[PDB]
């Protein structure tokens, strides 16, 4: 009855992130996504399997994990992770291809904040849930479902917190994520990695960047901005830590908030959220829970 690798047939190459190649496959007539790792990538495969198997993790805005398995083709062994399949693929792909309505933008932002709030939330009790920080949030690591809502993916670099002992489950390495989205404190290495809240705050800075990417694509009266990655106007493609630090920490710049966003309430709310995610001081940033609340109030008012 359970989904296993031997019963899945690969059909189409989707793409590749840091570790593992993603394919679309068919399991008992249904589409699934499969991330394939080689035997020498066992540590990366196991860590992502471990994060996704966390108690109480499942949420509509977190990629639906199905299974971790091995598949021996007779010559070599592949290490597989299987999840739900989402035809639209990444939010990066979606925003490159489409413009969104005001409702569309709010749906993407609210779902992203709801997934991050769930990841971040500690649940104490018998079947608890440790707080989890992502460490690599970006538009290529968020997927868009058929209903126009998002789900967070790419949990391999995540860190989990144990409140009872105030410990993090791994000894975290510095500057692990995508350089473009690294928070100021990660870029200048002032982050206190012994305090778990530091990792949640750095995820919020990255979410603010993702909200900027979405807001650019919100078309009102046919008016919108072209798709760009944050800092497209200040750093080269594949920027180094030094290039990012000079812009974000030294010159203290952030992505530009265009004048046209003050002409619409939804865009004024989004711009305010971004500014409050971009503070250099991690302690001053909004929480994912507070953002979820503000956006839920906005979606209720808009009638989404
Ligand atoms: F484009 C996609 C379309 N439909 C579904 C996922 C898509 N993309 C992705 N799939 C997976 C992935 C795939 C299978 C299992 C797992 C697991 F088990 F680790 F969750 N992950 N990781 C990703 N990281 C960034 C994007 C992305």
């Amino acid at each position: 009855h359970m989904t296993i690798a031997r019963d899945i047939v690969l059909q189409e190459s989707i793409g590749k992130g840091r570790f593992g190649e993603v394919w679309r496959g068919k399991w008992r007539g249904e589409e699934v996504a499969v991330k394939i790792f080689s035997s020498r990538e066992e540590r990366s495969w196991f860590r992502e399997a471990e994060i996704y198997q966390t108690v109480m993790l499942r949420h509509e805005n977190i990629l639906g994990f199905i299974a971790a398995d091995n598949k021996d083709n007779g010559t070599w062994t592949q290490l597989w992770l299987v999840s739900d399949y989402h035809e639209h693929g990444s939010l990066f792909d979606y925003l490159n291809r489409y413009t969104v309505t005001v409702e569309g933008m709010i749906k993407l932002a609210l779902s992203t904040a709801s997934g991050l709030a769930h990841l971040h939330m500690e649940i104490v009790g018998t079947q608890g849930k440790p707080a989890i920080a992502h460490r690599d949030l970006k538009s290529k690591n968020i997927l868009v479902k058929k209903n126009g809502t998002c789900c967070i993916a790419d949990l391999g670099l995540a860190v989990r917190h144990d409140s009872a002992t105030d410990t993090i489950d791994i000894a975290p390495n510095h500057r692990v994520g995508t350089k473009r989205y690294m928070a100021p404190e990660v870029l200048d290495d002032s982050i206190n990695m012994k305090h778990f809240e530091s990792f949640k705050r750095a995820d919020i800075y990255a979410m603010g960047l993702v909200f900027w990417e979405i807001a650019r694509r919100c078309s009102i009266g046919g008016i919108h901005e072209d798709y760009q990655l944050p800092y497209y106007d200040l750093v080269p493609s594949d920027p180094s830590v030094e290039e990012m630090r000079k812009v974000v920490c030294e010159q203290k710049l952030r992505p530009n908030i265009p004048n046209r966003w003050q002409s619409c309430e939804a865009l004024r709310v989004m711009a305010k959220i971004m500014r409050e995610c971009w503070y250099a001081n991690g302690a001053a940033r909004l929480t994912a829970l507070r953002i979820k609340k503000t956006l839920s109030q906005l979606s209720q008012q808009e009638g989404i």
Side-chain angles (χ1 to χ4, degrees), residues 2-15 17-96 98-125 127-164 166-258 260-299 302-303:
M2 291 179 85
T3 306
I4 63 180
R6 67 183 294 114
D7 292 340
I8 301 169
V9 175
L10 303 174
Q11 295 162 119
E12 180 180 17
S13 170
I14 292 172
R18 190 175 286 100
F19 296 106
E21 288 229 41
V22 183
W23 292 75
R24 174 175 61 97
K26 193 146 98 73
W27 171 72
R28 298 213 200 284
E30 289 196 268
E31 297 305 310
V32 292
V34 177
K35 192 181 322 199
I36 302 175
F37 300 77
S38 67
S39 61
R40 68 174 168 187
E41 294 173 321
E42 193 165 17
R43 293 176 273 271
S44 293
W45 164 84
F46 183 81
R47 182 57 174 173
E48 194 161 24
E50 174 177 45
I51 303 293
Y52 275 104
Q53 288 177 50
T54 301
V55 165
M56 293 293 291
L57 185 63
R58 292 181 66 92
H59 187 276
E60 63 179 325
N61 306 120
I62 294 177
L63 177 60
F65 177 82
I66 298 177
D69 206 356
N70 297 11
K71 195 178 195 159
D72 192 338
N73 60 20
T75 306
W76 69 95
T77 297
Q78 284 177 339
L79 303 174
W80 282 31
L81 298 179
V82 184
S83 70
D84 297 350
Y85 174 69
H86 296 300
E87 200 174 286
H88 285 314
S90 73
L91 175 61
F92 174 82
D93 289 350
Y94 189 82
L95 296 178
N96 268 273
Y98 308 113
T99 59
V100 295
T101 58
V102 162
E103 185 189 320
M105 163 183 69
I106 299 157
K107 285 174 71 198
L108 300 169
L110 174 53
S111 56
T112 301
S114 298
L116 194 66
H118 187 75
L119 199 69
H120 284 186
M121 175 188 58
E122 186 197 359
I123 301 170
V124 323
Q127 289 297 316
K129 178 190 162 296
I132 304 164
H134 193 290
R135 283 203 301 174
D136 195 20
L137 195 67
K138 59 178 180 179
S139 62
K140 284 184 177 81
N141 288 343
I142 300 166
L143 308 172
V144 182
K145 299 187 170 189
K146 188 172 191 169
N147 66 4
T149 72
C150 293
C151 63
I152 300 176
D154 226 66
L155 300 188
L157 288 178
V159 290
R160 299 185 298 182
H161 186 234
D162 183 80
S163 67
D166 200 26
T167 61
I168 299 137
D169 66 337
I170 59 162
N173 286 318
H174 311 242
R175 306 194 274 234
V176 296
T178 302
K179 291 150 175 68
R180 185 182 301 276
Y181 292 80
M182 285 180 180
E185 62 276 17
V186 171
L187 292 171
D188 65 14
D189 204 36
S190 67
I191 184 160
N192 176 9
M193 294 203 294
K194 290 179 177 177
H195 286 9
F196 180 76
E197 195 70 28
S198 296
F199 303 106
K200 281 165 69 189
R201 289 156 179 181
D203 281 349
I204 295 296
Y205 166 87
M207 197 171 67
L209 303 177
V210 173
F211 280 18
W212 179 89
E213 293 179 62
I214 299 167
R216 284 182 65 87
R217 307 293 287 160
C218 174
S219 189
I220 311 161
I223 307 306
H224 57 266
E225 291 76 42
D226 60 15
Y227 175 81
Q228 295 296 347
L229 276 161
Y231 303 106
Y232 74 99
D233 52 352
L234 291 161
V235 298
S237 287
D238 196 30
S240 63
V241 172
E242 261 305 307
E243 279 162 353
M244 290 310 307
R245 190 184 60 80
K246 293 178 173 180
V247 168
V248 176
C249 306
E250 295 184 63
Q251 199 179 170
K252 302 177 179 296
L253 300 178
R254 297 292 184 271
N256 178 59
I257 293 151
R260 78 135 187 137
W261 297 2
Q262 290 295 128
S263 78
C264 170
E265 178 56 13
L267 286 171
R268 295 194 293 263
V269 170
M270 285 292 289
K272 189 181 194 277
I273 291 162
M274 294 169 213
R275 290 189 204 101
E276 298 173 356
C277 291
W278 293 340
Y279 297 133
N281 186 349
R285 303 183 191 136
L286 300 168
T287 63
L289 195 55
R290 181 47 61 183
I291 297 169
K292 182 186 174 177
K293 288 164 173 187
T294 303
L295 296 172
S296 284
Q297 291 183 328
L298 184 68
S299 60
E302 295 286 335

